[PDB]
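User: Show me an example of a complex going from sequences to structure tokens.

Assistant: Sure. Here are the input components:
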Amino acid sequence: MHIMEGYLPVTHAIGWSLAAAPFVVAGALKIRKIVAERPEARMTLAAAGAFAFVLSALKIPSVTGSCSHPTGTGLGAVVFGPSVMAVLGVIVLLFQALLLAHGGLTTLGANAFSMAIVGPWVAFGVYKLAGKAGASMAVAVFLAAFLGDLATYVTTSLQLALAYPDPASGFLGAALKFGSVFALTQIPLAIAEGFLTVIVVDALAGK
Amino acid sequence: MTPILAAEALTYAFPGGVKALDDLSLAVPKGESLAILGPNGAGKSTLLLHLNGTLRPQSGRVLLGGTATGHSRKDLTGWRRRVGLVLQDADDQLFATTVFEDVSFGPLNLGLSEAEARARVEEALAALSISDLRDRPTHMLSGGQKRRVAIAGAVAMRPEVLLLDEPTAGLDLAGTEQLLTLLRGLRAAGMTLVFSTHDVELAAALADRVALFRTGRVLAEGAAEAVLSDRATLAKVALRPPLVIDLALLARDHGLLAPEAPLPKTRDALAAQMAGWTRR
Amino acid sequence: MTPILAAEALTYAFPGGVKALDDLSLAVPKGESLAILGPNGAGKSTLLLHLNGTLRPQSGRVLLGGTATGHSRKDLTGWRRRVGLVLQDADDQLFATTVFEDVSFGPLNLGLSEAEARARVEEALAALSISDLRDRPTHMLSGGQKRRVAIAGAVAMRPEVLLLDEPTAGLDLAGTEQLLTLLRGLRAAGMTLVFSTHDVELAAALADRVALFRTGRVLAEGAAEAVLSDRATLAKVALRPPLVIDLALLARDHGLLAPEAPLPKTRDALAAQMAGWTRR
Amino acid sequence: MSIASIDRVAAQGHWRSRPLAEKSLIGLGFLALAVTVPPFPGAVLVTVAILAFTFLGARVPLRFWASVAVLPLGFLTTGAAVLLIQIGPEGIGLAPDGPAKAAALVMRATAATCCLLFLATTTPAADLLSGLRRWRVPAELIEIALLTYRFVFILAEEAAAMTTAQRARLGHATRRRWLRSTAQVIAALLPRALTRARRLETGLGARNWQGEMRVLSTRPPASARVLGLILTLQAAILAAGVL
């Protein structure tokens, strides 16, 4: 999933932190706006982030023969639409680093960019496009979670490629390399996550 | 081999450290109700999680028909089919918007068709006298009825043994008396209940057998009247006897009761024998 | 002596429609313990939420010191400075992260300085014997320890009145006795305690005065002695006397205990009367 | 459960009370080194440095540390081998400086992962979030962060108890049932989190204001003395490794 700690050199690490910062500051500012208007949004924002974290820690069987934890990219994006996500994404990532060993602090930045930012941005575009093109709620949500996921895995695989261009083939070469090897685990993940988040939105509407 | 459920030499430490269960043995006779009495932090809830395969011990085993249970999924299915679990907080158990939907979960999971399952649900709601709640969204139910929907979901799978974790927690008197009614009703239909608690008066009102718990160990075990009359052993887990039983035992020493006589345990039985008492 | 706290004609209905509080009047004399006794769903908790300014009623008023309370943010501060509230589920008022930090919260919200806040926290932790817990993370606390952290949190502001919603809920005997000791201590330093419970045993141990509550109404009110023996009036709020007095009144029905005298209140006094019984 | 694992070690640990600024310059200082200093002399210095403090300084249970220090190993061997393999014109073979770059990635990465593991096992996340106070990060963003961390453990146990219930019935029999079972827990968790937030709103009101959540810690200040000591042991290692 995430790029582990110190897997990325300082120049790329800072670079991604700079590239994520404008979006992160955007969402930070929206939050401070709603919090002044509605002080209790402290609580409800903290609930939304803690929810995002605990589900990312739950147990999901894959399509393939692995075992995985959902990556609530699509869900958060469809339930807590995206600016806010860029901000709680940073928070969820931090705790995944400090609580589960999953993240990375120097790579938080690289990770912030893809899962938080990019992950939500594709999921949300895809949510609204499918809907307006006639997709039912269940199918829209499935394309949101599946393509959102797929996108973080593409972003991650490029960032690695940018960092480790292969000697023979160039960035293109490493992109194909990181991409094909992480496909073994992630596309079954992206599909199962798709199945998963559909059943949630369904249940949620029911409630 | 007569016990329907048994724990033997159960040892469990969370992968933290303390022994939640410490060389524990406990036996449940078929058709009887077993109170596992003991103070808070004695690992009672941890014991219930072993009795349905939720947790595996590090050492020891759980026996069902007199036969040891396994941990294959084929075994765990047959294990949980026979031993159902009711958590303390109903909000940890219900997920469906609709009541019928939630009580359906168990039976559908077994492999029942839909008519058979619907039938099960109808039997389950009946047994908890909430058949009228059948189509209410679960979230707008009072605490008590949420508690009945939770049990309904468990009895719908028709287990041989029903485990109830702190079943009266939060209930007032009427609620405790009503819950008790449905519990006896379940047992009168042949089920085995095990409830854990730390209320000795609840133990007096509902238990056939009582097992005293202290720090993951059974301190005493037997007929409720035997255990709940042991003023000294109850004392060692920071408890006292149930006042009816305590007084009923003083009546037996002072001779107001017969040597033969069982021993009342309830206001009903206490008062009935106060009808043959006569000074003052 | 004007009541230190009072309800006059309180009426409150949820935006559903039903009335939670129904033309309610209640006075709290300074320094005494007042139990609000009654079954689940009588709106006892709703009443507590008025008495600290959390809820505004449709009709009636809450009187502080003899003065009608207002709703300026300045007014509401002194209302909370002077009337503290402890909810049933301590987790609904700990946002915490550590015990010291959580208890610091109140003082800081009263416009107090850090040095004053830090001193208030020490007094509070001391008064509830959780000073060693000063740095325990709040999620890693027992249920009982969480209720003691929540009270420490309220008493760090120095209220005249402490409102406690179902304060013994979930506690074992030992836990109940410790809390009783600590509560009695607070009453001893001149603090006024008002608590709601469906447990007549809590009222028996801690209350000077008792108010019977049903369906948004105070049905009766008087000295703890008077109310807790009123088998007849307790019957109408679906309660029974504390178990000792009830069995003692069970002895009285069958004539074993003379009437117009000496109801046993402690258990040992009740045993003492068994010596006169003989048999028939 | 597994959520609270690392969190209790840093809660119950020998260095729990040591000043945040000292711990966090060890962790974030060496961490900064591990990513900047060239691997061989550089990363090895840090690794033994931080492994000292994790065992010389705090005394983190090593069996525990092992359990936490492994998962990275798995994601890691993968990268190493990808660095080792080359792709292009003729196709797929062995890269020139494969073992050179694979070894360098493994070294830089395990060193950084030891720094991170230092913070996580000696200093609680909440304390670190607080440490964001002296950076410029706004108070409401820290507050949301602290309260999230608090909501995590309440929700984690609710998630746990909910997965038990599902299991108690037969929610985990077939893989099909299992995926859907986890899904129902998720969807039922969210209303529980939101009602938790509303209820807290009421509860915090009993003590004056809900929002704006200022709390007093009991963290000790350390010493410009050992921070003097730490600050260029990290410039000691810094250049002995850049040569």
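The lines above are the inputs; the final block is the predicted structure for all four components together. The CA atoms of residues 205 and 253 of chain C lie 25 Å apart.
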